[PDB]
User: Fold Flagellar biosynthetic protein flhB from Salmonella enterica subsp. enterica serovar Typhimurium.
Amino acid sequence: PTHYSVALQYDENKMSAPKVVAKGAGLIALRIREIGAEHRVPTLEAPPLARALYRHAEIGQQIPGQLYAAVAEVLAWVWQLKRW
Amino acid sequence: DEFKESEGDPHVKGKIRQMQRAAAQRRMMEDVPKADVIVTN
Ligand code: NA
Ligand code: NA
Ligand SMILES: [Zn+2]
Ligand SMILES: [Zn+2]
Assistant:
């Protein structure tokens, strides 16, 4: 099937790190990717960061500091997306 | 009191928190629509 999924929510105020609302593998990982696509939640394949977030980020908490830069790169990607 | 004995049952308590892991997991999945991005693969 397929291995890892992590769902993030960007902070309520625009200037704080995002939080994990959901993570899983692999049935669970699949079922998150599914609900996301169903609800038009942007989904990026970035296998190194997904395994990392999945390993280290706690659900309901702010992502860890080791992963800010990388999750900020995912955000720039979400901005690229908002233009066709 | 037998009320305490039944209340304390380790076995009833273990099923109970088995079902909680499942329940909180489901609460996790129902929050996915709140997400702004999903990181995968
Ligand atoms: Na904690
Ligand atoms: Na949002
Ligand atoms: Zn429910
Ligand atoms: Zn919730």
